[PDB]
Design a protein around this nucleic acid. Structure first.
Lengths: 143, 189, 62, 72, 72
RNA sequence: ACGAGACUCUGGCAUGCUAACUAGUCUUAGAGGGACAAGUGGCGUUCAGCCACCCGAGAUUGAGCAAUAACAGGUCUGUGAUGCCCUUAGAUGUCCGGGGCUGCACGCGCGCUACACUGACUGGCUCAGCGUGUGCCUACCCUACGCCGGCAGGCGCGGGUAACCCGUUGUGAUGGGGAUCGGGGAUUGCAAUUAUUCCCCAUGAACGAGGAAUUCCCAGUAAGUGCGGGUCAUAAGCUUGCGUUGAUUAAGUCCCUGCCCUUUGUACACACCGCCCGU
């Protein structure tokens, strides 16, 4: 139970710029497509256990999960583990990266804004698209 | 073979006096090998007082709306680290056990006056049971605040619980707050 | 400040603008047995025992 | 506001902190975690390695407080 | 039975009652008095079950005692 | 003589009883028993009674019903229950039909909601519902395997007039509880968006007890939860019930609001939201 790895005070995965304060391997919120049941399924399929020491965990596991996410369609694995599915402009699940870019694409509002629809301006004002009631409850969204 | 628990025994712990058993009373059916005797302590007054001291300390910590009364928590806590410290000590915890709390205890509290006025409180006492248990409740709050937003957690303060439990000297914190209020109220005697 | 063990003889009742203090009467056991009165907070059962840690605390009545 | 503690495994520094725990009166992972201010899981791994050396025996398992003891 | 307080402590009531009946029937009654006195003098809850049960939801309120908030 | 009590229903109890091929006398429901302040202490013209304690399943144990006179309280929009003053043909009959009210600078009133090894998954040991369910109407009832992406389920497939079927229904913003919002096959309801319809990517929201004024509550209280009926298309966010988890505080007082078994004052009696005086 002794590892020859050294403690690293500089570690970089996906070219983000965030503070390293708490532990790792489930504070991966900065990493957008790895974690929870999909990562657990991949890890259990990789046949690795929890025998070693916690806290000092490197990024080989997350890199392997990302790499297996690169080409998931070949193995016929159930493809309901990706963010934007059945989207316009591509019938296949294409890869993207970088911070400050996923958030924009989480709301593809360009086409609905173009068609002069009420749902575009429902989304735009930050108000309720499905119609959450907001007159006595539901005042959050701007605080 | 009438030994209490599996490691103590009642044939030798004597005070040769039959009036100082207000805190430890193991001579009849009320003795428990494990405090999980179930039951209610709010059906009628003086029945919360007729709780054994041990069970009151272990239960009374139930507060907030999420751990409210779930006796599994109390029994698991009192079993855990107790099973460990009994074998890992070898010696007697009796000294600290007794000598922090069960005479840390205050000796008076305060009550309202006249028909108006919330600027001072007249000093009264109680028969030591109610005062000691109010101190115990504030010590439960103190153990929370030593766990709640802090480092030392719940189900690892068995030394402190044994301290809160046993018999007769003074080292506490919430009880010295109670003693400061003691003096403040006693400034009217 | 002697710890004196006294027996409760009669419990009066509650006092306060809403009721916050309880009156009892206690007789000493080995101090030339006589009866005094004192106020007290919290449960104090029928004919229980009080500890007069001080022999001078008197509660005003009404 | 987590503290910075030397966790580096070195030729020299490593074999100075693995021989300081048994020099205290009350030695348990919870006590060391409240006093020496290092994760209790490190103490858990330490006593597990002590078990691996064959000088103690396991009794029960728990994610917070483990039970390894001796009877000799 | 589901519920620890239910099936547990039912096991102890069961062992005590079966043992008491067996001793009463098969050997004598004085020995039965001695052993049953010992067992039910260890604790009382053996022969008594809790009579508390959920009471009916009452009138014009979410629960048996709570009431819908009254507006002035 | 009413009212109160008694009384009915309701839960609580048998090393007892009347018996079931769906449980093996545990479940169901009995002509019945059991508590009565009964036993013992302490307070009580030692009365009515109060407190305590063994014993006991249970020792001020849920609700229902509930006195004349009442009030111009509500109901003629529940009623070929009701006396006729009295409009309009835009009959306040019909016909999957047609704007709203699903606005957000809020004018108000019920409502939707828990702070960390307690909150939440490893799915690694037998769980409860109280109850509902298909033709005088009537055409609408509750539901178990396969096409399989990951299950209700687009079509067949049987059971149930029901105890038989549904159904034994590491020191605090991190991993921890979700701020709008998008994909998978959608339960088949013309329209749902101008209220019917699943969880997964962790995209980050004052992320740890709250203006004046505050409503409800004393033990299986409150509160957290889900579940079943009424409404009905399995339409609930409402209501009426039901269980599961479950208890910190008080066994008090008349201070606020209000009530009652008294005396007292009155110039009030439409009764103090009165009466009434003054250029």
């Amino acid at each position: 139970l002794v590892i020859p790895e050294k403690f690293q005070h500089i570690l970089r995965v996906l070219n983000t710029n965030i503070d390293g304060r708490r532990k790792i391997a489930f504070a991966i919120t900065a990493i957008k497509g790895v974690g929870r049941r999909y990562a657990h399924v991949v890890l259990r399929k990789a046949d690795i256990d929890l025998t070693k020491r916690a806290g000092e965990l490197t990024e080989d596991e997350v890199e392997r999960v990302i790499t297996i996410m690169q080409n998931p369609r070949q193995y016929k694995i159930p493809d309901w583990f990706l963010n934007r599915q059945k989207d316009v402009k591509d019938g296949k699940y294409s890869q993207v990266l970088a911070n400050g870019l996923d958030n924009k694409l989480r709301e593809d509002l360009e086409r609905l804004k173009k068609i002069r629809a009420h749902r575009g301006l429902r989304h735009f004002w930050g108000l309720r698209v499905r119609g959450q009631h907001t007159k006595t409850t539901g005042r959050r969204g701007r605080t | 073979d009438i030994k209490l628990f599996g490691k103590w025994s009642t044939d030798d712990v004597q005070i040769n006096d039959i009036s100082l058993q207000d805190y430890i009373a193991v001579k009849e059916k009320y003795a428990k090998y494990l405090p999980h005797s179930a039951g209610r302590y709010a059906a009628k007054r003086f029945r919360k007082a007729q709780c054994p001291i041990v069970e009151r300390l272990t239960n009374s910590m139930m507060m907030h709306g999420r751990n409210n009364g779930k006796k599994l928590m109390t029994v698991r806590i009192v079993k855990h680290a107790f099973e460990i410290i009994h074998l890992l000590t070898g010696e007697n915890p009796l000294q600290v056990l007794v000598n922090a709390i069960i005479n840390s205890g205050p000796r008076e509290d305060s009550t309202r006056i006249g028909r108006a006025g919330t600027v001072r409180r007249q000093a009264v006492d109680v028969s030591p049971l109610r005062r000691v248990n109010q101190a115990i409740w504030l010590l439960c709050t103190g153990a929370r605040e030593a766990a709640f937003r802090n480092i030392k957690t719940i189900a690892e303060c068995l030394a402190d619980e044994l301290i809160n439990a046993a018999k007769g000297s003074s080292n506490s914190y919430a009880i010295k707050k109670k003693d400061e209020l003691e003096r403040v109220a006693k400034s009217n005697r | 400040q002697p710890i004196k063990l006294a027996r409760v003889t009669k419990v009066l009742g509650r006092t306060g603008s809403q009721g916050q203090c309880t009156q009892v009467r206690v007789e000493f056991m080995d101090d030339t047995s006589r009866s005094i009165i004192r106020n007290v907070k919290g449960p104090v059962r029928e004919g229980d025992v009080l500890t007069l840690l001080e022999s001078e605390r008197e509660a005003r009545r009404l | 506001d987590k503290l910075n503690n030397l966790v580096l495994f070195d030729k020299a520094t490593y074999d100075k902190l693995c021989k300081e725990v048994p020099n205290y009166k009350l030695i348990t992972p919870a006590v060391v975690s409240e006093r020496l201010k290092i994760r209790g899981s490190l103490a858990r791994a330490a006593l597990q390695e002590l078990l691996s050396k064959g000088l103690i025996k396991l009794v029960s398992k728990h994610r917070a407080q483990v039970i390894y003891t001796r009877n000799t | 039975g589901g519920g620890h307080v239910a099936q547990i402590y039912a096991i102890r009531q069961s062992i005590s009652k079966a043992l008491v009946a067996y001793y009463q029937k098969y050997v004598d009654e004085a020995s039965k008095k001695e052993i049953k006195d010992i067992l039910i003098q260890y604790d009382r809850t053996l022969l008594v079950a809790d009579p508390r049960r959920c009471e009916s939801k009452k009138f014009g309120g979410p629960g048996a005692r709570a009431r819908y908030q009254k507006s002035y």
